[PDB]
Amino acid sequence: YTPSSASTVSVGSSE
Amino acid sequence: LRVGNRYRLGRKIGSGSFGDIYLGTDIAAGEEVAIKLECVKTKHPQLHIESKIYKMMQGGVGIPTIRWCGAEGDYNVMVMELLGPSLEDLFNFCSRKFSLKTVLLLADQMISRIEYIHSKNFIHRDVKPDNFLMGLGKKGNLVYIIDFGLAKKYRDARTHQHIPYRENKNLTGTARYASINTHLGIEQSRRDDLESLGYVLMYFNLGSLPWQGLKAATKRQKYERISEKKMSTPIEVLCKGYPSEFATYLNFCRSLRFDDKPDYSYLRQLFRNLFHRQGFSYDYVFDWNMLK
Ligand SMILES: Nc1ncnc2c1ncn2[C@@H]1O[C@H](COP(=O)(O)OP(=O)(O)O)[C@@H](O)[C@H]1O
Numbered sequence: 596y597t598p599s600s601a602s603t604v605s606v607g608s609s610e
Numbered sequence: 611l612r613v614g615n616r617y618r619l620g621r622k623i624g625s626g627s628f629g630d631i632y633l634g635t636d637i638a639a640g641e642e643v644a645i646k647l648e649c650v651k652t653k654h655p656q657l658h659i660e661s662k663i664y665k666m667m668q669g670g671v672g673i674p675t676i677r678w679c680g681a682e683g684d685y686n687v688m689v690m691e692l693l694g695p696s697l698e699d700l701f702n703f704c705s706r707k708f709s710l711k712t713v714l715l716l717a718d719q720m721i722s723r724i725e726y727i728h729s730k731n732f733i734h735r736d737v738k739p740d741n742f743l744m745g746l747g748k749k750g751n752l753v754y755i756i757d758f759g760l761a762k763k764y765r766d767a768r769t770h771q772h773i774p775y776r777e778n779k780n781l782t783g784t785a786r787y788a789s790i791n792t793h794l795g796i797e798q799s800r801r802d803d804l805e806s807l808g809y810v811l812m813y814f815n816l817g818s819l820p821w822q823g824l825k826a827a828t829k830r831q832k833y834e835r836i837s838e839k840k841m842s843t844p845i846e847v848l849c850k851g852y853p854s855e856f857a858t859y860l861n862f863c864r865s866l867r868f869d870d871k872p873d874y875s876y877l878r879q880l881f882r883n884l885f886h887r888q889g890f891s892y893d894y895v896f897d898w899n900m901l902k
């Protein structure tokens with residue numbers, strides 16, 4: 596299961 | 611609570627990727643501000659880096675002013691200009707429909723914000739309705755860009771040498787608005803910020819994108835379904851029923867080479883020509899100004 600907010604949450608960092 | 615010398619902390623107004631945003635007062639000036647707090651003890655400190663990027667951006671139209679940076683008790687502190695609602699907030703207040711005139715008013719400013727950021731050697735990498743805020747008061751007609759949490763240099767400040775091409779990258783940014791290159795694991799460049807804006811603009815036109823609400827068992831599977839849907843949706847199908855400029859804009863962004871300097875001025879002129887053919891005036895009367 597993945598929450599539907601997976602498509603709109605910011606992912607990663609400056610790296 | 612007393613922050614710096616002259617700032618009073620009020621209630622929380624926001625939470626992004628890290629820290630929290632509070633209403634504040636500049637007690638000395640008599641002006642409301644936003645105060646970002648980050649716990650000094652955090653695992654991955656980011657506020658100091660973000661404040662460095664905001665300081666390099668200072669002088670730009672629609673870049674929030676930084677008023678103060680420092681550390682106070684258990685917190686790193688960045689005091690900024692208080693901004694208004696996000697474009698996502700305003701989209702909800704307008705029943706998730708923007709008039710063509712509002713979308714074109716916004717496109718003009720948003721292309722300019724992204725250009726300005728690129729001129730300071732950074733890519734934003736998180737272009738989405740949540741990260742553009744309208745100003746307040748005399749700044750009520752200005753679109754601001756925020757959230758430099760994923761921002762990074764795409765070129766040396768001195769040489770303007772572009773970062774190298776790289777593949778097999780994790781998704782960075784927001785899946786819904788991510789460029790096809792980002793989905794394919796390609797290093798982000800100037801083109802990817804503009805491609806993302808292209809999807810934001812069609813999101814405003816449509817009320818949703820055809821790759822929203824895809825069922826999957828995993829984040830990575832969700833991202834891949836989004837990727838597959840984007841790659842299998844022709845730009846002319848995405849943009850069907852809307853002025854051709856939206857399709858021309860997305861075709862131009864998808865044609866850019868990794869290290870190409872976008873023709874920002876061409877992309878603005880596309881929308882500006884359409885604005886004129888519609889007989890709209892640049893009076894900054896947005897849909898949400900009509901709310902009674
Ligand atoms: N200067 C500001 N004025 C008003 N609200 C803000 C401001 N900065 C951020 N916010 C709100 O807080 C949320 C979190 O912001 P964040 O992504 O941490 O951006 P930043 O680090 O640029 O302030 C935003 O979505 C927005 O709703």
Ligand code: NA
Nearest residue numbers: 751894895896
């Ligand atoms: Na206005």
